[PDB]
């Protein structure tokens, strides 16, 4: 088994794409190279850490599938579906560009010594921060999974408290994409008064059953469990 | 008013470069660059407080008003293609200009820095996304009648090309640079220059001739490079004549040009220039100094 | 003086708005935080162009001391 | 850290001589321009008591110290005093060799050319400095304020200047000499205490009355409306504690004191106002450079310290000069120590280095070199 | 001492702008903004660069102003014109002349009629510009 | 997307702007495909005056609640209103040129549109007052 | 080994240094991960005033001993202080902005962090002196 077989399958993977001597194991939820003897233990090994991302990989579209196809994931959730994608975009694109160089490594033909050679290893090492980036995106959807609405900008929150530099930046900034929608609603109801929660995802409730006389009384109530972290209880009674 | 001084240092702490994380000699580099960014902008500041009048720039554009130009650069943005930015920018400088109550008592002096901060200012600009509504020509609710012509479509295609094309070398760039980071000598580039490497011996001429002598090993070379095959001096030719003598180690404009008048002096000797060529004269009649050569 | 205020932040505003289109084309380097100190101090009746030479020169000053701390780091 | 060998900044104010290194944001030292000796010579003679003290130290030592004033309204009226004074600053609070370090000097507006001889054989030979340069404190002050062309309003405690300065060159047919400063307006001041009732009159009570004019004492924007407000409201009147509990009350004071600004009769002063100060200086200046000279006042000194004087002064410059001259008061909120970061500023000039005169060049030309070197 | 060089259109607007107003720059600032306007986005790629026909049309309204002679005049001094190399743009020179000519007849105080005729020019348009 | 659907919106709602703008400022219906929010049944006016029904004011404009704009649905009434008060204006034989007829543009967030339907409801209203008195 | 320790010290600082940037600016912690050398204690407030015991001085805000730098230990007692002066200040319902809030940075020879929190110290200590009087 040539190397850059190796490599085609481990861009398939990276694809989710199932290789010719790589496969999914799905008893292992993860992509398994085939027994075919002619496989290095140490190239086992190799591919093993790929298939670590290509788990990964596989995971976060598995929640992309899930999430877009479900209207009762509201627009915040569609929101963070889209910015998930954007992210996912972002690691496609740095996948096209490696498997460009994969592609310029296989035509070139000649094994060039030199330090910038497309090695397994340099793979490897090409994908380490991406494989971190992937880690920690995989973490926030296993965090997320389940949660919608102010639960999921909780959960958001709840992982905004990373110690890892590179985890707090994409962090914060898929916190900002997400409390944007979710801010706006939030801020236009308790300000405005529109209340367009389809899915009663923002912390305001209003009672549409209180008359006039119990309005003040009853006719706004707070959804607890709907109020983001990044909101004070004493912010969301003000709002409210 | 806060002093010069204070508006100086703030200047210059503002300016001052953000530090790289490297933590320790950039926070005494700062203190002393600021001591020194403040006496550059000082020399700066003074660069004709003591030039002398002859050093006297240009009068011609500085009594120019503002105005003319930002009329000037808007002329130049529209020659640039960038039309609708010449118009918003000739709008936002004609409410600049018109504002009755400036709330600033040099803000015809801010516009005049601002020209003068023309070309200051900081640059890839991620291309403007068209808007679906901009280029909807065909959207709206007086339509003028227009041709077939895609003048407008052709510039379109350009942008979009443009935008892969800018896509794609970012790409490039992108693998050219990691290679090329990649690509490094075996133990160059590591960032701990010295922790992980042997230091290279750049410094101390003690350390230079040690890494060159290979700690002393070598005796009459010396080298930088790893790679060199060791070779000891061939043996001299003369050795079989002369014996072997003990080597002793040696002790050691066009229209301002238009107002130029010509000669009428023509001559049927000339054809090509007729701008006339000066007999001059001859056989005393050249005048004195001719005359005393003569003598 | 709220009003005063409101006026002034209109105005760096605008100024902030042309300076950040000439300062696209410029490709210099100058920001727009810096342009509002500046200003305070041409309010103070610094020359302009004594200005603009100043920032010119803190620019490349800038670029020395980014070269010295990409070395030093 | 390149211990590059920092040039001597000596600002010479009026009331106090403020002194330091340069590129520093201001004098490292600062101590009023007095020298004191032992009153007594005999009894603390044993207990090592120097033969005189001066600045801070003389104050420390003003109850066994006669106090005296090498410079005397602005001028310099014993040089052996002031070249001791600068010596004891150099040795003991700046703790530096004099010969290690190039020293900037300032002088006073109009310092007499045999003056300035003095000072700098006194520098030249006494402190062995390696280079030195004499540079006018209000022009050190324009530096500071940036500019090359303007006026210069420099006022201490003991003497006012108003020096024209055009394209860095200072113009000497405009400079005004005005002999009323901070010392003036604190005798002023004093006799108004006595009037209001608390009692003055040891030098010690001198300068508590010093002291509460420069804390309480503000220039009104126009001194006849201040002064009829504080006639009219007690807004204006200030009560005073003194250190033994008692209570003086101060009210027109508060702007009668610096209205001698504008009206130096109310402080019993002949000289003319700073409006007409001002008018004359711009009169004697050039009328090409009238304009600028008006959009370039500098405010420096101690003396440029008090509270409203701006708004006065632009209220007074504007009435005073054409509708159609631009009037640029800049009062640097530092005026007080002006003088000092002119200094430091002129003195960190690259170009400037060259302009100092070396030990050798004094040696060469003698104490005549300051008429003859510094131009 | 002047060589002649590529100067701005700001420059060449500015001193066309102030002897034709007759006045500083400062007095042509509102005539000067709409000219630049009007200038900045104009580019001729419709333009033929043929100077046959800038000399047909002259010729043809020199007859019409009855100037034969100067017409034979004007031929005479386009000949001159074409042997001295100076001008590299004599076509847009042409253009430029022809639309500011003045009739002198418009010799006379007017013009008789205005009939414009088809016969025109090229329209260049035809490239890709 | 959001970008894409706003094109969209403010494309889909010129053709209805329009034709809303041609009611409140006309009250003239000039819809070939009946798709304004309000339609038109043909009263016979002769009847309309001699019926006891206000055929002219109740018949001869309906609404169509299918074809009332979600987004104009909150003033769908005062349209109605407005536009049965100009035609009501039109048939007394005095034209009225509305004043504040402007270009209705879709908008997102400002719900200007609304602001601009309920200044020409109140001039309508104004117009209509006058003539009555 | 000294370098690469030094970078790796200031990292670890960033974040404490970050906590006590808040505390000593704002009298905030906003310690998420319980690593400052300051620890809070839920006092009951409403006894924090009828409690004998300074429970809101005392109580509220405790020194975790474990928790102190060694780097900043020296200072720790004048941290301690400068906390509980500016939660005082904030609990007083006077909103204090802290003007000397600037970035703290480990740095190993020059113990300028001490300098800075010294500043910030007495800042604190005048605004809570001239706030007592």
Same mark, same amino acid.
């Given at each position: 088994?040539?190397?850059?077989?190796?490599?085609?399958?481990?861009?398939?993977?990276?694809?989710?794409?199932?290789?010719?001597?790589?496969?999914?194991?799905?008893?292992?939820?993860?992509?398994?190279?085939?027994?075919?003897?002619?496989?290095?233990?140490?190239?086992?090994?190799?591919?093993?850490?790929?298939?670590?991302?290509?788990?990964?990989?596989?995971?976060?579209?598995?929640?992309?599938?899930?999430?877009?196809?479900?209207?009762?994931?509201?627009?915040?959730?569609?929101?963070?579906?889209?910015?998930?994608?954007?992210?996912?975009?972002?690691?496609?694109?740095?996948?096209?560009?490696?498997?460009?160089?994969?592609?310029?490594?296989?035509?070139?033909?000649?094994?060039?010594?030199?330090?910038?050679?497309?090695?397994?290893?340099?793979?490897?090492?090409?994908?380490?921060?991406?494989?971190?980036?992937?880690?920690?995106?995989?973490?926030?959807?296993?965090?997320?999974?389940?949660?919608?609405?102010?639960?999921?900008?909780?959960?958001?929150?709840?992982?905004?408290?990373?110690?890892?530099?590179?985890?707090?930046?994409?962090?914060?900034?898929?916190?900002?994409?997400?409390?944007?929608?979710?801010?706006?609603?939030?801020?236009?109801?308790?300000?405005?008064?529109?209340?367009?929660?389809?899915?009663?995802?923002?912390?305001?409730?209003?009672?549409?059953?209180?008359?006039?006389?119990?309005?003040?009384?009853?006719?706004?109530?707070?959804?607890?469990?709907?109020?983001?972290?990044?909101?004070?209880?004493?912010?969301?009674?003000?709002?409210? | 008013?806060?002093?010069?001084?204070?508006?100086?240092?703030?200047?210059? =702490?503002?300016?001052?470069?953000?530090?790289?994380?490297?933590?320790?000699?950039?926070?005494?580099?700062?203190?002393?660059?600021?001591?020194?960014?403040?006496?550059?902008?000082?020399?700066?500041?003074?660069?004709?407080?003591?030039?002398?009048?002859?050093?006297?720039?240009?009068?011609?554009?500085?009594?120019?008003?503002?105005?003319?130009?930002?009329?000037?650069?808007?002329?130049?943005?529209?020659?640039?293609?960038?039309?609708?930015?010449?118009?918003?920018?000739? =709008?936002?400088?004609? =409410?600049?200009?018109?504002?009755?109550?400036?709330?600033?008592?040099?803000?015809?002096?801010?516009?005049?820095?601002?020209?003068?901060?023309?070309?200051?200012?900081?640059?890839?600009?991620?291309?403007?996304?068209?808007?679906?509504?901009?280029?909807?020509?065909?959207?709206?609710?007086?339509?003028?009648?227009?041709?077939?012509?895609?003048?407008?479509?052709?510039?379109?295609?350009?942008?979009?090309?443009?935008?892969?094309?800018?896509?794609?070398?970012?790409?490039?760039?992108?693998?050219?640079?990691?290679?090329?980071?990649?690509?490094?000598?075996?133990?160059?580039?590591?960032?701990?220059?010295?922790?992980?490497?042997?230091?290279?011996?750049?410094?101390?001429?003690?350390?230079?001739?040690?890494?060159?002598?290979?700690?002393?090993?070598?005796?009459?070379?010396?080298?930088?490079?790893?790679?060199?095959?060791?070779?000891?001096?061939?043996?001299?030719?003369?050795?079989?004549?002369?014996?072997?003598?003990?080597?002793?180690?040696?002790?050691?404009?066009?229209?301002?040009?238009?107002?130029?008048?010509?000669?009428?002096?023509?001559?049927?000797?000339?054809?090509?220039?007729?701008?006339?060529?000066?007999? =001059?004269?001859?056989?005393?009649?050249?005048?004195?100094?001719?005359?005393?050569?003569?003598? | 003086?709220?009003?005063?205020?409101?006026?002034?932040?209109?105005?760096?505003?605008?100024?902030?708005?042309?300076?950040?289109?000439?300062?696209?084309?410029?490709?210099?380097?100058?920001?727009?935080?810096?342009?509002?100190?500046?200003?305070?101090?041409?309010?103070?009746?610094?020359?302009?162009?004594?200005?603009?030479?100043?920032?010119?020169?803190?620019?490349?000053?800038?670029?020395?001391?980014?070269?010295?701390?990409?070395?030093?780091? | 850290?390149?211990?590059?060998?920092?040039?001597?900044?000596?600002?010479?104010?009026?009331?106090?001589?403020?002194?330091?290194?340069?590129?520093?944001?201001?004098?490292?030292?600062?101590?009023?321009?007095?020298?004191?000796?032992?009153?007594?010579?005999?009894?603390?003679?044993?207990?090592?008591?120097?033969?005189?003290?001066?600045?801070?130290?003389?104050?420390?030592?003003?109850?066994?110290?006669?106090?005296?004033?090498?410079?005397?309204?602005?001028?310099?009226?014993?040089?052996?005093?002031?070249?001791?004074?600068?010596?004891?600053?150099?040795?003991?609070?700046?703790?530096?060799?004099?010969?290690?370090?190039?020293?900037?000097?300032?002088?006073?507006?109009?310092?007499?050319?045999?003056?300035?001889?003095?000072?700098?054989?006194?520098?030249?030979?006494?402190?062995?400095?390696?280079?030195?340069?004499?540079?006018?404190?209000?022009?050190?002050?324009?530096?500071?304020?940036?500019?090359?062309?303007?006026?210069?309003?420099?006022?201490?405690?003991?003497?006012?200047?108003?020096?024209?300065?055009?394209?860095?060159?200072?113009?000497?047919?405009?400079?005004?000499?005005?002999?009323?400063?901070?010392?003036?307006?604190?005798?002023?001041?004093?006799?108004?205490?006595?009037?209001?009732?608390?009692?003055?009159?040891?030098?010690?009570?001198?300068?508590?009355?010093?002291?509460?004019?420069?804390?309480?004492?503000?220039?009104?924007?126009?001194?006849?409306?201040?002064?009829?407000?504080?006639?009219?409201?007690?807004?204006?009147?200030?009560?005073?504690?003194?250190?033994?509990?008692?209570?003086?009350?101060?009210?027109?004071?508060?702007?009668?004191?610096?209205?001698?600004?504008?009206?130096?009769?109310?402080?019993?002063?002949?000289?003319?106002?700073?409006?007409?100060?001002?008018?004359?200086?711009?009169?004697?200046?050039?009328?090409?450079?009238?304009?600028?000279?008006?959009?370039?006042?500098?405010?420096?000194?101690?003396?440029?310290?008090?509270?409203?004087?701006?708004?006065?002064?632009?209220?007074?410059?504007?009435?005073?000069?054409?509708?159609?001259?631009?009037?640029?008061?800049?009062?640097?909120?530092?005026?007080?120590?002006?003088?000092?970061?002119?200094?430091?500023?002129?003195?960190?000039?690259?170009?400037?280095?060259?302009?100092?005169?070396?030990?050798?060049?004094?040696?060469?030309?003698?104490?005549?070199?300051?008429?003859?070197?510094?131009? | 001492?002047?060589?002649?060089?590529?100067?701005?259109?700001?420059?060449?607007?500015?001193?066309?702008?102030?002897?034709?107003?007759?006045?500083?720059?400062?007095?042509?600032?509102?005539?000067?903004?709409?000219?630049?306007?009007?200038?900045?986005?104009?580019?001729?790629?419709?333009?033929?660069?043929?100077?046959?026909?800038?000399?047909?049309?002259?010729?043809?309204?020199?007859?019409?102003?009855?100037?034969?002679?100067?017409?034979?005049?004007?031929?005479?001094?386009?000949?001159?014109?074409?042997?001295?190399?100076?001008?590299?743009?004599?076509?847009?020179?042409?253009?430029?002349?022809?639309?500011?000519?003045?009739?002198?007849?418009?010799?006379?105080?007017?013009?008789?009629?205005?009939?414009?005729?088809?016969?025109?020019?090229?329209?260049?348009?035809?490239?890709?510009? | 997307?959001?970008?894409?659907?706003?094109?969209?919106?403010?494309?889909?709602?010129?053709?209805?702007?329009?034709?809303?703008?041609?009611?409140?400022?006309?009250?003239?219906?000039?819809?070939?495909?009946?798709?304004?929010?309000?339609?038109?049944?043909?009263?016979?006016?002769?009847?309309?005056?001699?019926? +006891?029904?206000?055929?002219?004011?109740?018949?001869?404009?309906?609404?169509?609640?299918?074809?009332?704009?979600?987004?104009?649905?909150?003033?769908?009434?005062?349209?109605?209103?407005?536009?049965?008060?100009?035609?009501?204006?039109?048939?007394?034989?005095?034209?009225?040129?509305?004043?504040?007829?402007?270009?209705?543009? +879709?908008?997102?967030?400002?719900?200007?549109?609304?602001?601009?339907?309920?200044?020409?409801?109140?001039?309508?209203?104004?117009?209509?007052?006058?003539?009555?008195?």
């Amino acid at each position: 088994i040539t190397e850059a077989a190796l490599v085609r399958d481990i861009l398939y993977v990276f694809q989710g794409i199932d290789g010719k001597n790589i496969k999914m194991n799905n008893t292992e939820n993860c992509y398994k190279v085939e027994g075919k003897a002619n496989l290095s233990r140490s190239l086992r090994d190799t591919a093993v850490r790929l298939s670590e991302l290509g788990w990964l990989h596989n995971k976060i579209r598995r929640y992309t599938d899930q999430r877009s196809l479900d209207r009762s994931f509201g627009l915040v959730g569609q929101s963070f579906c889209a910015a998930l994608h954007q992210e996912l975009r972002e690691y496609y694109r740095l996948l096209s560009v490696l498997h460009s160089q994969l592609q310029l490594e296989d035509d070139q033909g000649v094994n060039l010594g030199l330090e910038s050679s497309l090695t397994l290893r340099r793979l490897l090492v090409w994908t380490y921060d991406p494989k971190i980036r992937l880690k920690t995106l995989a973490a926030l959807v296993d965090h997320c999974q389940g949660r919608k609405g102010g639960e999921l900008a909780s959960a958001v929150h709840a992982y905004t408290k990373t110690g890892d530099p590179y985890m707090r930046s994409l962090v914060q900034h898929i916190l900002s994409l997400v409390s944007h929608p979710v801010l706006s609603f939030l801020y236009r109801w308790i300000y405005d008064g529109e209340l367009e929660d389809t899915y009663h995802e923002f912390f305001v409730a209003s009672d549409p059953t209180v008359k006039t006389d119990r309005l003040w009384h009853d006719k706004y109530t707070l959804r607890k469990s709907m109020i983001p972290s990044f909101m004070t209880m004493d912010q969301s009674r003000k709002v409210l | 008013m806060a002093s010069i001084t204070q508006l100086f240092d703030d200047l210059c =702490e503002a300016l001052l470069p953000a530090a790289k994380t490297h933590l320790g000699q950039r926070s005494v580099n700062r203190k002393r660059a600021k001591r020194s960014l403040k006496k550059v902008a000082y020399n700066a500041l003074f660069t004709n407080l003591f030039q002398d009048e002859t050093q006297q720039l240009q009068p011609d554009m500085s009594k120019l008003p503002a105005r003319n130009k930002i009329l000037m650069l808007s002329f130049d943005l529209r020659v640039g293609g960038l039309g609708p930015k010449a118009d918003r920018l000739e =709008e936002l400088v004609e =409410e600049l200009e018109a504002a009755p109550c400036c709330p600033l008592l040099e803000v015809g002096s801010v516009l005049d820095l601002l020209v003068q901060l023309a070309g200051s200012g900081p640059p890839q600009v991620l291309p403007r996304k068209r808007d679906y509504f901009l280029n909807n020509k065909h959207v709206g609710r007086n339509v003028p009648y227009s041709g077939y012509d895609c003048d407008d479509l052709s510039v379109f295609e350009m942008d979009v090309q443009s935008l892969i094309s800018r896509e794609e070398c970012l790409c490039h760039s992108m693998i050219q640079e990691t290679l090329q980071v990649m690509e490094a000598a075996p133990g160059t580039g590591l960032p701990t220059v010295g922790l992980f490497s042997f230091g290279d011996p750049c410094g101390d001429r003690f350390e230079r001739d040690t890494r060159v002598s290979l700690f002393g090993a070598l005796v009459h070379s010396r080298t930088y490079d790893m790679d060199v095959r060791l070779g000891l001096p061939p043996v001299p030719d003369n050795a079989d004549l002369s014996g072997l003598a003990i080597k002793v180690p040696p002790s050691v404009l066009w229209e301002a040009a238009l107002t130029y008048e010509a000669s009428k002096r023509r001559c049927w000797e000339r054809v090509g220039c007729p701008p006339g060529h000066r007999e =001059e004269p001859y056989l005393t009649e050249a005048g004195r100094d001719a005359f005393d050569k003569f003598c | 003086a709220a009003a005063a205020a409101a006026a002034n932040l209109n105005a760096v505003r605008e100024t902030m708005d042309v300076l950040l289109e000439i300062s696209r084309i410029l490709n210099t380097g100058l920001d727009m935080e810096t342009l509002s100190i500046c200003v305070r101090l041409c309010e103070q009746g610094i020359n302009p162009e004594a200005l603009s030479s100043v920032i010119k020169e803190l620019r490349k000053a800038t670029e020395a001391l980014k070269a010295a701390e990409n070395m030093t780091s | 850290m390149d211990d590059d060998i920092a040039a001597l900044v000596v600002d010479n104010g009026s009331g106090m001589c403020k002194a330091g290194f340069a590129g520093d944001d201001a004098p490292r030292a600062v101590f009023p321009s007095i020298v004191g000796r032992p009153r007594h010579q005999g009894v603390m003679v044993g207990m090592g008591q120097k033969d005189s003290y001066v600045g801070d130290e003389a104050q420390s030592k003003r109850g066994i110290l006669t106090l005296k004033y090498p410079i005397e309204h602005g001028i310099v009226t014993n040089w052996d005093d002031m070249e001791k004074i600068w010596h004891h600053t150099f040795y003991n609070e700046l703790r530096v060799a004099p010969e290690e370090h190039p020293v900037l000097l300032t002088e006073a507006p109009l310092n007499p050319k045999a003056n300035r001889e003095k000072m700098t054989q006194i520098m030249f030979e006494t402190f062995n400095t390696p280079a030195m340069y004499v540079a006018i404190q209000a022009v050190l002050s324009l530096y500071a304020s940036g500019r090359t062309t303007g006026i210069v309003m420099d006022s201490g405690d003991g003497v006012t200047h108003t020096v024209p300065i055009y394209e860095g060159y200072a113009l000497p047919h405009a400079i005004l000499r005005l002999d009323l400063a901070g010392r003036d307006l604190t005798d002023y001041l004093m006799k108004i205490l006595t009037e209001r009732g608390y009692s003055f009159t040891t030098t010690a009570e001198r300068e508590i009355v010093r002291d509460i004019k420069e804390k309480l004492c503000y220039v009104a924007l126009d001194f006849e409306q201040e002064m009829a407000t504080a006639a009219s409201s007690s807004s204006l009147e200030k009560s005073y504690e003194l250190p033994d509990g008692q209570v003086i009350t101060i009210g027109n004071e508060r702007f009668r004191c610096p209205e001698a600004l504008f009206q130096p009769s109310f402080l019993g002063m002949e000289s003319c106002g700073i409006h007409e100060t001002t008018f004359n200086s711009i009169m004697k200046c050039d009328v090409d450079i009238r304009k600028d000279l008006y959009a370039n006042t500098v405010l420096s000194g101690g003396t440029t310290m008090y509270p409203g004087i701006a708004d006065r002064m632009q209220k007074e410059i504007t009435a005073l000069a054409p509708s159609t001259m631009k009037i640029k008061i800049i009062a640097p909120p530092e005026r007080k120590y002006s003088v000092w970061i002119g200094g430091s500023i002129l003195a960190s000039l690259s170009t400037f280095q060259q302009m100092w005169i070396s030990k050798q060049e004094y040696d060469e030309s003698g104490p005549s070199i300051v008429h003859r070197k510094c131009f | 001492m002047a060589t002649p060089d590529q100067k701005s259109p700001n420059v060449l607007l500015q001193n066309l702008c102030c002897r034709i107003l007759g006045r500083s720059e400062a007095d042509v600032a509102q005539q000067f903004q709409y000219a630049v306007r009007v200038i900045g986005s104009n580019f001729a790629p419709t333009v033929e660069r043929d100077e046959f026909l800038v000399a047909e049309k002259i010729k043809k309204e020199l007859i019409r102003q009855r100037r034969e002679a100067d017409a034979a005049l004007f031929s005479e001094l386009h000949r001159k014109l074409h042997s001295q190399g100076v001008l590299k743009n004599k076509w847009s020179i042409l253009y430029l002349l022809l639309s500011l000519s003045e009739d002198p007849r418009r010799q006379p105080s007017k013009v008789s009629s205005y009939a414009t005729l088809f016969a025109q020019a090229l329209p260049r348009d035809a490239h890709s510009t | 997307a959001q970008e894409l659907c706003l094109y969209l919106t403010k494309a889909a709602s010129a053709p209805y702007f329009e034709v809303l703008e041609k009611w409140i400022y006309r009250g003239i219906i000039h819809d070939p495909y009946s798709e304004f929010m309000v339609e038109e049944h043909e009263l016979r006016k002769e009847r309309i005056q001699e019926d +006891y029904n206000d055929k002219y004011w109740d018949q001869r404009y309906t609404i169509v609640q299918q074809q009332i704009p979600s987004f104009l649905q909150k003033m769908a009434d005062k349209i109605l209103s407005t536009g049965k008060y100009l035609n009501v204006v039109r048939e007394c034989g005095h034209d009225v040129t509305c004043p504040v007829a402007k270009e209705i543009i +879709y908008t997102l967030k400002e719900r200007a549109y609304v602001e601009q339907i309920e200044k020409a409801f109140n001039y309508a209203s104004k117009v209509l007052l006058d003539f009555l008195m």
